Subunit: 500 residues, 3 copies
């Protein structure tokens, strides 16, 4: 039960500096994030865009190559979980607060405003651009990290860490040396800022959903939502035990409430129009896939840079930062799975759920816009969902259910991430200290709250700007994780049985 204090102190110190900086110096912190956002988006936006699509190609090649047959674990090892059970668990890997936050807003803004290189009121571009940010690019990054940890821990028996995946390139001297520790420090920092963004989005949307109950104010979002969801629920469940019996119950509530919320909009909404957006979004996603993969700051005659920072480069930075958690989560539930089957399940099942989600919620909002009724309202992204729900019969009750669903994603997402952060701080130990897991949840919630407070009126922008800067160092870890992964697969397994 040793603690990697050399990995805790660096990653921890950076968090407190961000929390201290964003509270007493909101102006200075806001300026730096805006300034740093500009430097990263200009000088490295190509790197996010270029390597975003390299990940999709790289993981498809790996699945279709000889490496697909490799089995994550002992040869002829039965998977620990059934296929249907394994499929049902990836839903806990999904981004339930981002899907709820951007379920209506994203396809609606693309429809209302258009995207660079396209005109307004284009349904296919609206749905295809949303599927770009949510289906394959996010889950190619998670597959790469999940595959690297799965192979290292199961097929090679190495420590469950991000640095253990780099043993092929830097060996054990680097993995336990300065470079290995740096890779593990950047993984914790990325997870804190990747998770903090979702917690901040959820707190923002719950605050908008409470408009029916109370008027919104800074303290309502600041203390009430933040402290209540982080304290009464996250700490208590974690402190009581590693498996508090609440996270398993709440993980069920996330599945049940999400399905009921989708079914209510699907049934009570424009059912036929939603079913039209199923093949419409998949077809237009595949048609425009490379047209959006090649959209850079020089697209639209050079005017695409501002849009990309808000939408595409933010999502790429967000996915890159969530990779250490989602990679660890997918690795755990995929022992004994083949590489080809692991990639196919991870790539396609989450893509199918995101497609259906945005068709129901994105399609319903677009249908309203077409008919004249606009749920746009003022335009804030945190109240588009509750505008959509209030526009259907029974919306008041389901609007309350959406608030409860967000609350259970806040606790579930914090507990799932804090568990991985504890593993990285205990030399890859599967069962981590209750206090260590609690502390990482507090820090992540403190970061997500500080981003909201510092931003003020532009709370969402400060949330997005900080995530891009925090995910930049780990973009190069994922790139080097592709080279390490090929060396690992090519070195051990091939020579094991057939070649030698």
């Amino acid at each position: 039960a040793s603690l990697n204090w050399s990995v805790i102190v660096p990653a921890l110190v950076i968090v407190l500096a961000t929390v201290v900086w964003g509270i007493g110096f909101k102006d200075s912190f806001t300026n730096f994030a805006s300034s740093a956002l500009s430097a990263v988006v200009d000088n490295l936006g190509w790197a996010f865009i270029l390597f975003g699509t390299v990940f999709v190609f790289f993981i498809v090649v790996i699945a279709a190559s000889k490496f697909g047959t490799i089995r994550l674990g002992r040869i002829d090892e039965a998977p620990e979980f059934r296929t249907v059970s394994w499929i049902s668990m990836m839903f806990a890997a999904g981004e339930g607060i981002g899907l709820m936050f951007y379920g209506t807003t994203e396809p609606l803004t693309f429809y209302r405003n258009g995207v660079p290189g396209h005109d307004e009121h284009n349904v296919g571009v609206a749905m295809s651009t949303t599927m770009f940010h949510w289906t394959l690019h996010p889950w190619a990054i998670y597959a790469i990290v999940g595959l690297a940890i799965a192979y290292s821990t199961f097929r090679v028996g190495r420590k469950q860490l991000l640095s253990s995946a780099f043993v092929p390139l830097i060996g054990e001297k680097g993995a336990e040396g300065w470079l290995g520790k740096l890779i593990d420090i950047l993984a914790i920092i990325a997870t804190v800022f990747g998770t903090a963004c979702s917690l901040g989005l959820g707190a923002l949307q719950i605050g908008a959903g409470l408009s029916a109950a109370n008027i919104i104010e800074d303290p309502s979002d600041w203390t009430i939502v933040g402290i209540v969801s982080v304290l009464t629920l996250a700490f208590i469940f974690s402190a009581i035990s590693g498996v508090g019996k609440g996270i398993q119950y709440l993980s069920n509530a996330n599945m049940v409430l999400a399905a009921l919320l989708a079914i209510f909009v699907f049934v009570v909404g424009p059912t036929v129009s939603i079913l039209n957006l199923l093949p419409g979004s998949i077809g237009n996603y595949l048609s425009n896939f490379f047209q959006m993969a090649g959209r850079t700051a020089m697209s639209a005659d050079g005017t695409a840079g501002e849009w990309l920072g808000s939408w595409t480069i933010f999502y790429w930075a967000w996915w890159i930062s969530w990779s250490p958690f989602v990679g660890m989560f997918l690795a755990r539930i995929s022992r004994g799975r083949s590489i080809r089957e692991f990639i196919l399940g991870v790539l396609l099942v989450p893509a199918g759920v995101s497609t259906v989600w945005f068709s129901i919620f994105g399609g319903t909002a677009i249908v309203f816009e077409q008919n004249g009724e606009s749920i746009w309202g003022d335009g804030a992204a945190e109240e588009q969902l509750f505008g959509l729900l209030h526009a259907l019969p029974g919306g008041q009750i389901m609007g309350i259910i959406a608030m409860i669903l967000l609350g259970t994603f806040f606790i579930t997402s914090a507990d799932s991430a804090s568990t991985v952060m504890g593993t990285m701080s205990q030399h890859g130990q599967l069962e981590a200290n209750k206090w260590v897991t609690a502390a990482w949840g507090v820090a992540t919630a403190a970061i997500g709250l500080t981003l909201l407070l510092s931003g003020g009126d532009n709370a969402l922008s400060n949330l997005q700007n900080v995530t891009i800067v925090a995910a930049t160092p780990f973009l190069f870890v994922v790139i080097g994780l592709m080279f390490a992964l090929v060396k690992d697969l090519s070195n051990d397994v091939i020579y094991l049985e057939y070649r030698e």
Copy 2:
């Protein structure tokens, strides 16, 4: 060997008492078809569009998988036909009447009017859209149904029926039970209306051809009756005379006459422009494939719904209703082949023939539009081919040949389909009774004539409306045929 009357009577009652009484109540029939068409297109257009493209993906994955090495028959068994006879045998089946009917109009109307999401006068979109409805989506449906029948009756030795292909899902108890009969009844009803649509188009075009040749005035309802009555009688005489040499004489004449017509327009039309369209049709088809596959009733800002019901959803329903006949036809001529070579041949050979055919007739009509000439006339879809032909030297002679070519496709299509329905009503008997074969052909021509007579001015609209309604029940059989086929393929003798 005996007749399955539990399948004939349910199918005959729907064909006889329900539809063929569209001559007694035309106003009532048209309203139902219009109302039923709106219900299907609105509430189930997504299903046709979504699963039309899944068939293409599913069939490509089957060939690319380890299943492609399975032989359709006994292991290490050679194909019965040569790869040249086999490939030329695919030139039977086929639309034939649909290619002549829509050979000129479909690419021309898309050029004149455009398509949802695109502006008019786009040659790439006009030709890519035509290739969408005729090359891969139709022949992925046929390959699935043909592959399921070929696998069940050749490798596994089951009966040659649609229901026998569902034994993996429903078991032998189901295949002989209520569900097995329902699948066979739906297969017959789909084939009757899928073929009745082709016969209706063939009779409409022959009526337009006769007026264009000045033999008759504008064709009336009685003239259409004579065409269908005369052609069906010629079909009966061949069938009831026994095993006749006439049908193969007509099947060969279809190849020569169809090729003679395509060569004439190619050599006499804008050869260079037609040739330019061969890369243009194929390149733009692959460019827009998924853009067209993602076109739904709420594309073009909720404006593609009317267009889809007339053009895309009609074809998908038309192909799904054709699948039982073309599936059985492909199974017979593909014994001993591998799944990979069967799929690739079925997918690509018709894709190349359709691409070349529409380039000669779609391209020639579009070239006239650009130059200043125009074969649109009054906009009727049945008179465009003869407008194209009469616009070229020697057009009068070749216009007659087009009518002759349509007449032979009528008998060839009625007989080829009536043979499959006879097999479905005789527990999979290949050598079906000649009397049952003639009965199914008469009903098909009676249904086609009813759709034309009922529609009146909007004769085409009534053909397309009823076809979409008839094919909707069989859309879910083909969806289930994918699950049945995969289970069957997985549980092969080589591996369980």
Copy 3:
């Protein structure tokens, strides 16, 4: 190996006839080239466009098939060049002069004027259209011709000749008869005119560079003669002297000066914008690949014919002319490599260089257009690189390096191609006589000069018209080489490789 006078003469008099016709009768030569260009583009433009993309599919389908594992050489053979070295030699047999000439002009032209079916000021279309003409279509032709030559020479032990690759179709007797001689004659003629075009572009740009550097008042007709005479003489000295140290030293300078030029523009130019165009050009290339593959004279409502004849049908003809040389060059350095390794290396490595090259020079030129500057100037295609350089600090000294780089490309392009021509006029001898190698290089320079002199104010247009006519016969040799390569490879799987 005795000289093949039955092949030299038919290919020589056609070369000699072009020189006399194009020098003493400039007016008649240009009229025939324009008339013949229209006939070829109108009646066979479909064939160039159809089969340009069939080559890409064919070569990809061969690498991914069971043939991908076949080794180019005796079984269990190892390549004599490391993968790093083998990749380095790929840069030789690249255009060099073509990249230098069209590095700035092509992407800038499409951005400013647009392409059929698209509007102006489209960076994605401008960059993808340039990638269409330089990345996969050219190198799918070179991989087909190089693979066919490599397989028949190493795996089968035939002669290092193009007609030897048709033995599966026309038998051993056929390769020695008229049909085999015809393929050899066409292969030489195609190489001479494909090489003359690159040399003609090189002398056209050098004359522009001299004027841009104020060394000379203007590039008169005699100025172009002086450039070609000086550079062709230097090529002769290297071949006659027998000292290969000179050429290998020049070949290294090409990589050093080319990389130096590219890095200078990358660093002093808009670096961030250049980096944006890397994913932007690759992504928009894969998006539009089939839209551009389907572009014919019937596109844009029947208005793309003139554009295609100038841009796409010229490049397809130009690559078909370069095929015999790049085919032999690739085969020589690709011994012991599997089919899959050869196809992947040949397709992807040169595609990577071209994407970077046009992003640096095309992207810099486009960025100047956006900001209000414009290196377009008079619109002359041979002065756009030097307009781009003089717009950057230190571009006057770097303008000289661009000219010296053009000259070294001129010397090595002539020597590299004439070596292949000498080989294929001496029964496939690996090292033919230096005198015969020098004779073919001089003949190549004479046509390049003749096309430039005959064209006059339309020198560039004359080069393209003649290149399209010369490559038309060879378009069918490459088409049939696909049917001969599959037949030859299949006989190996019977051998089981």
